[PDB]
Design an enzyme around this catalytic site. Structure first.
Site, PDB file in Angstrom:
ATOM      1  N   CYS A 176     -24.344 -19.493 -14.709  1.00 19.75           N
ATOM      2  CA  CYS A 176     -24.230 -20.680 -13.713  1.00 19.75           C
ATOM      3  C   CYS A 176     -23.845 -22.019 -14.348  1.00 19.75           C
ATOM      4  O   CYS A 176     -22.586 -22.334 -14.303  1.00 19.75           O
ATOM      5  CB  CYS A 176     -25.284 -20.575 -12.649  1.00 19.75           C
ATOM      6  N   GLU A 216     -25.839 -23.494 -17.514  1.00 24.68           N
ATOM      7  CA  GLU A 216     -26.765 -23.500 -18.358  1.00 24.68           C
ATOM      8  C   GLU A 216     -26.331 -23.464 -19.757  1.00 24.68           C
ATOM      9  O   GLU A 216     -25.590 -22.704 -20.114  1.00 24.68           O
ATOM     10  CB  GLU A 216     -27.993 -22.653 -18.297  1.00 24.68           C
TER      11      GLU A 216
END
Lengths: 792, 792
Positions: A432, A434
């Site tokens: 997502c 990171e």
């Protein structure tokens, strides 16, 4: 600055619609082969067993090449279907034999021949899962906390880990035979003086045996490409297949010499990894950087045909699918495996890293318009305007991608965690939002969700949830003197649950380290080969664990609401706030003092409006969380690091929290990541952006997530794009880490709801990835429709 | 000086005969219960799984009080029978199902209900044994050397570890409930800021559950003692039973209150350890040192009834048995579990430790005269003449007991391995001749049997065994320029094979540490409770690994034969000796030149005649091994240390070796420990004493074993005792570590061969332990018969 997009070839659109039409299935071959590989090899150390699992799967998993493909490789027989990986967990699959095709979120067909043979293999597994071992290392109160929905570590306990950008570039240049050479040469220079050469030697012998089958898999697709060429009647398609056969006979066993080969190398790595383990977030990373040298030295390929191979790869990235249990599946909703590919940014030296494959990746997204990959861009100070104003032009297509990540916050943030400037400059994005130093990190970048809203609920209820003493008795709400006495009780509760959350994460960690280290994945991350240790045993240079807060805006506007409406303006008593919370603001009871207290609380200054007092509280609660997390270390020598991102669970874990002091009714959705709360940022996108930038993103070094939604007409024309670019830059200049935008009218989403048949390809962001809107359960769709609509 | 020996109670004589007239059975109940506990607990950490294993056996194993016992606690339904521990190995038990009752060395009756019962349980096991894991960690080269007879790690491969002297005194003061409390105080002081607590806490939670279980086990023997007491119709036996019932309800749950309960606490430890794991050499150790407080503090007990209880402890130690595969059984011959019990020596404070219980432990051995315990005495400069003379006066009964250990060599030998003077002073002997600081050590005092004679064979054949290149080609025998070149070749060989011997012992070590850490045993060894770790993970303060050498005299007198008869005295050439060695000295051809050569070598000087020339070759060759074993470490973090003792395989391992330069024919026996070759020490015991003392006993710190055999008349009278005492001081004063004696006529042993039905109770010394002579194979019998007969 308004340049338009070309179209894809008829084959690409054919390849695309195959993904779009295909009905997802559960399949048994890999689960059966994997199971039989454990049965035959009870006596080996976990590493050598795991080499036998991949050797037998690679040697025997059905080979499938689909009509019209140029890049080939398939994890399942049926497109967009899923394998079953019972080494991690099984029972929920056999429980849903009869219900998984009819369930709400991510339904899958389980036809009876498959349930019959998945039934058989599952007789082997009871108590031999990595999950069942992770379950056993956990304290009793930690299970109890997870049971009352304080926090969950389901991702890596039910499934595999993944969450890594492997060394695609290495395999492109030395091959699988290249990896094997590095392991035989390591195997000659072992210090064999002490005892610890023995386990190392086992690791090496595993890594070699896996890559000898990882070669035979490529070869084994090659003979099926020839088989299909000898039997093909269209002369042109015959020659595609004859040379697909030639591509697979050289790569990835050896290095790539064309672009076609290099694209096929990429796909075997990307695909084969999700056969070894069901870990999602296998993220291609900086695929514009490590794939460009192979394009530039292809003085034979044409512009059109290069773009067609980039379109094919995009479409193959959508061929992966993964089933989860009815409930986990609502948190990763959309048949999402979260494979993130970033383009752009800086080289390790400091120059901008734009190249011609950067713009072709941007074209491929605009050709394919499918939810995968999690297409992304990297922004830094020297980012060419031609790049930002072209990513923007792509965003305005309303697919959600690219997401935008800020070198000037992420890179100092990676340094705070012991990443060198040299490694931080090379960062890619995982899943997502990171960041990691690609091919040198075991990240554990979505080990857990953690519900800070629920910790506020419990904080106010003296450590109680339901009527069950879940946390410390830090005082009854009605006995606070000031906000000091609150932050005191709130910090104590936070140290209790974060310590429990860590126990849970490390238990799943010991579990994977002890029952299922990966000899295939491990060879593609530094420094597993030099150290003769798996990723699961700490082999990587950098090691982390990433737990996710959410209900952040919720906790904040709530803590501030107590500050303003009880202590500063004295407009209600602490006892009345208690009684109102308990009664769900009289939602059923129709008690009108508890509605009047709601109305007061709904109309408190909200995080998201460029208002310092309330924004600083959102920041402080975010910090209380992030500061507890970083105090703790994992079994691989690494440090925990907070992130704030909601996948599709902000509706789900919203159900775990009673009414909050911010006027939120019990069980309603929560705030998505560090977004201002649904519809409560009312002064526009810069006010919103400014507030979100006041949060400490640097300390939340597993990544933050910010959602904005625009109507199309506010990004029309060149001063549409010029404003859309000045907002990104304003946001990143004020030290925010990430922003990604929906661009869509609400009637579009409303017609998507009433007439699902006619919006099968409407793809929008959920959070950190895009999904087909109609695949999303209605409570999620409504959360996306309820998100504030920004206007310039 | 000649004092005599009291007689045992008629009860003790019935209890003695019950042992002697027993037929050993293989039983199944503990093997089946162990197996069901594994099935039920697949999901648990190994340590915790082993808590549930030990729990099920303890709660459910048959409880059996034998007629007449004052001290009760039985491992097997049937007296002197064996259990099965399939966790270590199983397959040989099943292959022997019908042969075991009929083999030569150590038969056991397997009744078919027992075989069907075992057959079923074994279906669980393929590949899950510690043997199976140990095996797949070893290299193909190390398995080859083992397959060709160079060395073996079978002991801890096929069975459990044992080789320990646990903290009896600590269970005697504070009991199992006291152990539970240390684990609770450890558990409450855990530093929980890392991930290291998660595994320390499993171990603690695993030690409590085991020790709860052990408390039920004692309580169950009490319910059986009371059940039988309600049905007893002789009143004397009735009070006895309800007095046994009271003992087992206090001890060892709590601390011993009388001497009786101290004895039943001892026996419960000594028995139950051998229930959780079949590891043998569970050695009581300083039994006179830690029981004696409880004998002194008993103001009520009579000496007659106190001596009688100690006798039931000797007998009850003969009740333990262990079957091994039919080859193994030949090397640990005699129904031998080697539970060594020493008395006397120095306190931690440097002064003599003799107490009234010391002489009561000698009187036991005169009363019971059964193989067990492996009875020992410590000796130091300050040994009272009283004790040495009384110990001899007991050795003169010709049981082989006591063995004698020299404090002045053992204590500094352990200091050279890192053991404190405080801790070395308190040492006991494990197994045969292996010393340790009791309850502070995981010593692995019998990790392996390493064939030094077989290495000489392999050296002179340029590293071959058969036609198979087993070690480096260190050069051919015909090309040695002198004894310098030989030692070069011999040391390259020893460095090669000792390296694989280490790789072997360490795989078995890792296997056990991964698949069978013992939570019950672990809690009675410093520093396992403190550190949060098991003996299998390095919980012990001291950690070792002790391989043993075979054919020291054989290597010695062969090397020297070359030196003298080839290089010095030119009676052979290097080629002739290769022909005669390769042709087994014409044992089969009838070649007279080789028969001449055999007579010339076999009439060279021999180690054991106080001849420095040849004795120092023996010193050199023993050092070459000892000095190479010293270089290596084990996975628990401690040093290998070489021992020299033969147990019962100086015949069996002779079978692995061709004719040697000393004139030994192919396959004949090897010399037992550091003793001279059989009948080659012809100038008397004092001259042989001097030769064995020229060896470096200090570096061989896992213990050396010297054997002597004596005419009964030569030790007759108190002139015989002053001589016999004066020989022991001679050899100890000259820095030899251990001596043990047979006192037996030749025709006693001959008649025992020829009317075994009238010599059922003839016990003699084999090597570091004693056995029923008649139980032993004729080849082992003939070997003991062929030992030199000393004569003053």
């Amino acid at each position: 600055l308004e340049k338009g997009f070309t179209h894809p070839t008829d084959r690409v659109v054919r390849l695309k619609n195959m993904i779009l039409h295909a009905k997802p299935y559960v399949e048994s071959e890999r689960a059966v082969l994997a199971t039989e590989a454990y049965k035959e090899n009870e006596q080996l150390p976990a590493i050598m067993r795991r080499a036998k699992v991949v050797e037998k799967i690679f040697n025997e998993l059905p080979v499938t090449i689909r009509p019209d493909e140029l890049i080939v490789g398939a994890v399942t027989i049926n497109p967009r279907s899923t394998e079953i990986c019972p080494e991690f967990s099984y029972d929920w699959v056999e429980k849903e034999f009869d219900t998984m095709a009819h369930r709400v979120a991510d339904p899958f067909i389980i036809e009876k021949k498959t349930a019959d043979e998945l039934h058989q293999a599952f007789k082997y597994w009871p108590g031999k899962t990595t999950s069942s071992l992770a379950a056993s290392y956990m304290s009793e109160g930690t299970k109890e906390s997870m049971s009352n929905g304080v926090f969950t570590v389901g991702n890596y306990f039910f499934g595999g880990i993944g969450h890594v950008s492997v060394d695609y570039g290495k395999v492109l240049k030395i091959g699988f035979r290249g990896i094997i050479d590095e392991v035989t040469r390591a195997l000659e220079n072992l210090d064999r003086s002490t005892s610890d050469y023995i386990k190392k030697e086992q690791f090496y012998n595993a890594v070699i045996l896996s890559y000898q089958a990882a070669i035979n898999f490529a070869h084994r697709y090659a003979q099926e490409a020839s088989r299909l060429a000898r039997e093909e009647r269209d002369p042109t398609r015959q020659r595609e297949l004859e040379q697909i056969a030639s591509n697979c006979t050289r790569v990835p066993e050896y290095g790539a010499t064309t672009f076609w080969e290099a694209c096929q190398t990429f796909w075997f790595i990307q695909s084969m990894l999700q056969i070894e383990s069901s870990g999602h977030s296998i993220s291609p990373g900086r695929f514009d950087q490590y794939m460009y040298p192979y394009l530039a030295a292809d003085t034979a390929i044409s512009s059109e045909f290069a773009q067609e191979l980039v379109d094919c790869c995009w479409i193959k990235l959508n061929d992966i699918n993964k089933t989860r249990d009815e409930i986990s599946a609502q948190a990763f909703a959309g048949y999402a495996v979260f494979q993130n590919l970033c383009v752009g940014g800086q080289t390790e030296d400091g120059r901008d890293a734009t190249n011609p494959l950067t713009y072709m990746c941007m074209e491929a997204t605009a050709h394919v318009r499918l939810p995968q990959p999690s297409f992304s861009i990297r922004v830094w100070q020297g980012t060419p305007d031609e790049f930002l104003y072209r990513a923007c032009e792509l965003v305005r297509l309303g697919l959600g991608v690219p997401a935008m990540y800020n070198d000037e916050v992420i890179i100092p943030a990676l340094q705070n965690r012991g990443v060198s400037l040299h490694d931080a400059r090379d960062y890619c994005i995982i899943g997502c939002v990171e960041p990691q130093a690609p091919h040198r990190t075991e990240g554990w970048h979505d080990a857990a969700f953690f519900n800070v809203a629920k910790v506020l609920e419990i904080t106010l209820n003296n450590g109680r949830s339901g009527n069950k003493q879940l946390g410390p008795m830090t005082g009854e709400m009605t006995q606070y003197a000031g906000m000091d006495d609150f932050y005191a009780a709130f910090k104590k509760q936070m140290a209790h649950f974060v310590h429990q959350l860590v126990e849970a994460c490390n238990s799943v960690d010991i579990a994977h380290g002890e029952r299922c280290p990966l000899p295939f994945l491990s060879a593609l991350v530094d420094d597993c080969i030099g150290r003769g240790k798996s990723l699961q045993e700490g082999g990587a240079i950098y090691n982390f664990t990433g737990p996710q807060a959410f209900g952040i805006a919720d906790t904040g506007d709530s803590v501030y609401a107590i500050q303003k409406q009880v202590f500063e303006d004295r407009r209600l008593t602490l006892q009345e706030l208690k009684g109102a919370l308990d009664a769900n603001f009289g939602y059923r009871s129709g008690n009108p003092r508890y509605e009047e207290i709601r109305h007061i609380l709904e109309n408190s200054p909200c995080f998201g409006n460029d208002i310092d007092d309330v924004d600083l509280v959102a920041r402080q609660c975010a910090l209380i969380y992030c500061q507890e997390v970083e105090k703790y270390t994992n079994p691989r020598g690494g440090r925990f690091q907070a992130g704030i991102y909601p996948v599709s669970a902000n509706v789900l874990f919203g159900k775990d929290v009673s009414a909050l002091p911010d006027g939120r009714l019990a069980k309603e959705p929560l705030a998505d990541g560090v977004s201002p709360r649904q519809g409560k940022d009312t002064l526009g996108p810069t006010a919103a952006a400014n507030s979100v930038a006041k949060l400490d993103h640097f300390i939340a070094s597993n990544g933050t997530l910010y959602n904005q939604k625009f109507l199309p007409s506010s990004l029309a024309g060149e001063k549409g794009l010029r404003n859309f670019g000045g907002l990104v830059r304003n946001y990143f200049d004020k030290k925010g880490m990430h922003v990604q935008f929906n661009v869509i009218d609400r009637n579009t989403l409303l017609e998507a709801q009433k007439n699902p048949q006619q919006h099968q390809d409407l793809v929008v962001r959920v959070a950190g990835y895009s999904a087909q809107f109609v695949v999303l359960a209605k409570e999620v769709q409504d959360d996306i429709i309820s998100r504030t609509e920004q206007q310039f």
